[PDB]
C-alpha cells in the first residue's frame, strides 16, 4: 500500500510528503527531474520515500511508466501536479493542457495498469473551480460544494488568473467525468480537494527563497515592499493554511465519508492590508521596514465577498481550520527569522 503523489516538489506536495512520513506511509513522489528528486531526497532523509521522474504532465501517457512499475504496491494517488507557474502568453500550452492532460493521464495510467489496485484518488482542484472570478466581491453568490465555476473554454483566458481558474475547472471537469464513465471498469473512488489561496510555511526554511511559490509570494512581497507602497484594502479572496491542506489530503484517502466528495476549504476573506497588518501587530520592532498599519479593511466593515458555505467540508473533515493570525505570523515569521532578524 504505497503512495503516489503528483508534483511532489511544490508548496502544498511537500507538507502533504511530510504527513504521509508522519504516518509511516511509502511514498513515490513524482518530480520533474532528477535535480529536483536528489535535493528533495536529502531534505527528508527518510528511506520510505522515492522519486519517479515525470517531465511534463501533459506528455503523452505520461504516468504510464510508473504503473508499469509500481502498480502492484500503490494503493493511494494523490493527483496534486497542476501548473501554477507559466507564460502570461501561452497559456493553452502552459496552464490549460498541461492541468487537463495531467489529469487524463494520470487517470487512464491507473485503467490501464491498476484498475483494481488503486483504492483512492485524492486530486488537488481548487477554490477556483468552485467560485466565479469576477464575483468573489458579489455578497449575493454563495458558494457551496457544489458549485462550479461557469467559465467556458471563450471566455477563460479574459486575463491570467482566468486562465488559471479555467485550468482547475476544466482539469476537474474532466476527472468526475472519467469517474462517471468508468465506474464499473476502474476500482478507484475520487475525492477532490479545493484550496483557495495557501498560506504557512514552506515544509522547510531552506526553501524560503528570494521570491515564493504563487500564493505566499503575496506575502513574501508585501512583507518587503517599501513602506511607502501603496496596498489594497478591498476584500481580495479567502484563504486556508497549508497545514489544513495537508493534512485534508490525507484524510482524503483514508475517511470513508469523503468519497466522492469536492471539499471546499476556506477559513477566511481579507485584503492585502489585512496581510500588512499581521506584520504590523506581531513584529512591532520592525515598524516602517515594511508598510504601515491600517484597520480599514473591507474585512474590518464586515465585508468579505461572496458567501463560503462549507459546513459539510467542515463536518466531514471534522478538525478545527488555522485561523487567519496564525496562519500569516507563521509564514512571516519564518522569513524573518531564516533572514537573522527575529
Ligand atoms: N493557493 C495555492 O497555492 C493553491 C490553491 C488551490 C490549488 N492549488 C493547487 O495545489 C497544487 C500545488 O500548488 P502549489 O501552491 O504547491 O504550487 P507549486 O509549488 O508551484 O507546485 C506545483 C507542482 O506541480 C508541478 N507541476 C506544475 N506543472 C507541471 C507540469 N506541466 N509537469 C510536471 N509538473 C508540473 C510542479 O513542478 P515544477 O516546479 O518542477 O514545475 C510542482 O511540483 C496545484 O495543483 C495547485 O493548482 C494551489
Redesign the pocket.
Given at each position: 500500500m504505497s503512495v503516489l503523489i503528483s508534483?511532489?516538489?511544490?508548496?502544498?506536495?511537500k507538507h502533504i510528503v511530510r504527513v504521509l512520513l508522519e504516518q509511516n506511509y511509502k511514498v513515490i513522489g513524482t518530480?520533474?527531474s532528477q535535480d529536483?528528486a536528489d535535493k528533495l531526497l536529502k531534505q527528508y532523509n527518510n528511506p520510505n520515500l522515492s522519486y519517479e521522474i515525470?517531465p511534463?504532465?501533459?506528455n503523452l501517457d505520461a504516468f504510464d511508466d510508473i504503473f508499469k512499475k509500481h502498480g502492484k504496491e500503490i494503493k493511494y494517488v494523490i493527483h496534486?501536479?497542476?501548473?501554477?507557474?507559466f507564460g502570461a502568453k501561452d497559456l493553452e500550452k502552459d496552464l490549460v493542457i498541461?492541468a487537463i492532460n495531467?489529469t487524463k493521464n494520470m487517470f487512464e495510467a491507473i485503467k490501464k495498469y491498476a484498475p483494481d489496485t488503486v483504492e483512492r484518488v485524492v486530486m488537488?482542484a481548487?477554490?477556483?473551480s468552485i467560485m466565479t472570478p469576477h464575483r468573489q466581491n458579489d455578497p449575493t453568490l454563495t458558494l457551496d460544494e457544489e458549485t462550479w465555476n461557469p467559465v467556458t473554454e471563450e471566455n477563460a483566458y479574459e486575463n491570467v488568473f482566468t486562465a488559471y481558474c479555467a485550468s482547475?475547472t476544466f482539469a476537474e471537469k474532466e476527472a468526475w467525468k472519467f469517474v462517471k464513465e468508468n465506474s464499473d471498469a476502474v476500482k478507484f473512488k475520487l475525492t477532490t480537494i479545493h484550496?483557495?489561496?495557501?498560506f504557512g510555511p514552506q515544509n522547510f526554511d531552506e526553501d524560503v527563497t528570494k521570491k515564493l511559490?504563487?500564493?505566499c509570494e503575496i506575502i513574501n512581497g508585501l512583507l518587503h515592499a517599501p513602506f511607502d507602497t501603496k496596498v489594497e484594502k478591498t476584500h481580495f479572496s479567502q484563504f486556508i493554511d497549508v497545514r489544513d491542506v495537508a493534512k485534508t489530503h490525507v484524510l482524503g484517502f483514508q475517511k470513508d465519508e469523503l468519497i466522492n466528495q469536492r471539499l471546499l476549504l476556506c477559513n477566511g476573506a481579507f485584503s492585502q492590508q489585512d496581510i500588512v497588518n499581521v506584520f504590523n501587530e506581531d513584529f512591532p520592532e520592525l515598524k516602517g521596514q515594511f508598510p504601515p498599519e491600517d484597520k480599514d479593511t473591507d474585512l474590518n466593515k464586515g465585508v468579505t465577498g461572496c458567501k463560503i458555505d462549507n459546513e459539510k467540508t467542515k463536518k466531514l473533515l471534522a478538525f478545527e481550520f488555522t485561523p487567519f493570525h496564525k496562519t500569516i505570523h507563521d509564514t512571516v515569521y519564518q522569513i524573518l527569522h531564516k533572514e537573522g532578524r527575529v
Amino acid at each position: 500500500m504505497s503512495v503516489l503523489i503528483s508534483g511532489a516538489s511544490g508548496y502544498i506536495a511537500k507538507h502533504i510528503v511530510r504527513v504521509l512520513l508522519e504516518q509511516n506511509y511509502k511514498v513515490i513522489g513524482t518530480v520533474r527531474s532528477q535535480d529536483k528528486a536528489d535535493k528533495l531526497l536529502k531534505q527528508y532523509n527518510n528511506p520510505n520515500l522515492s522519486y519517479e521522474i515525470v517531465p511534463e504532465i501533459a506528455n503523452l501517457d505520461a504516468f504510464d511508466d510508473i504503473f508499469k512499475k509500481h502498480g502492484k504496491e500503490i494503493k493511494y494517488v494523490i493527483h496534486a501536479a497542476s501548473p501554477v507557474n507559466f507564460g502570461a502568453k501561452d497559456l493553452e500550452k502552459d496552464l490549460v493542457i498541461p492541468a487537463i492532460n495531467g489529469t487524463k493521464n494520470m487517470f487512464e495510467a491507473i485503467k490501464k495498469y491498476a484498475p483494481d489496485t488503486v483504492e483512492r484518488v485524492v486530486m488537488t482542484a481548487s477554490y477556483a473551480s468552485i467560485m466565479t472570478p469576477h464575483r468573489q466581491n458579489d455578497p449575493t453568490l454563495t458558494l457551496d460544494e457544489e458549485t462550479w465555476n461557469p467559465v467556458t473554454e471563450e471566455n477563460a483566458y479574459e486575463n491570467v488568473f482566468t486562465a488559471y481558474c479555467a485550468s482547475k475547472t476544466f482539469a476537474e471537469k474532466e476527472a468526475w467525468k472519467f469517474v462517471k464513465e468508468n465506474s464499473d471498469a476502474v476500482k478507484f473512488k475520487l475525492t477532490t480537494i479545493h484550496p483557495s489561496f495557501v498560506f504557512g510555511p514552506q515544509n522547510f526554511d531552506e526553501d524560503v527563497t528570494k521570491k515564493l511559490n504563487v500564493s505566499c509570494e503575496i506575502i513574501n512581497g508585501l512583507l518587503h515592499a517599501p513602506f511607502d507602497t501603496k496596498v489594497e484594502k478591498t476584500h481580495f479572496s479567502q484563504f486556508i493554511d497549508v497545514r489544513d491542506v495537508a493534512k485534508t489530503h490525507v484524510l482524503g484517502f483514508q475517511k470513508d465519508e469523503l468519497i466522492n466528495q469536492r471539499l471546499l476549504l476556506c477559513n477566511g476573506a481579507f485584503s492585502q492590508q489585512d496581510i500588512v497588518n499581521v506584520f504590523n501587530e506581531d513584529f512591532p520592532e520592525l515598524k516602517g521596514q515594511f508598510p504601515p498599519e491600517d484597520k480599514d479593511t473591507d474585512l474590518n466593515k464586515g465585508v468579505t465577498g461572496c458567501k463560503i458555505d462549507n459546513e459539510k467540508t467542515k463536518k466531514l473533515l471534522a478538525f478545527e481550520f488555522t485561523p487567519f493570525h496564525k496562519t500569516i505570523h507563521d509564514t512571516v515569521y519564518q522569513i524573518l527569522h531564516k533572514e537573522g532578524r527575529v
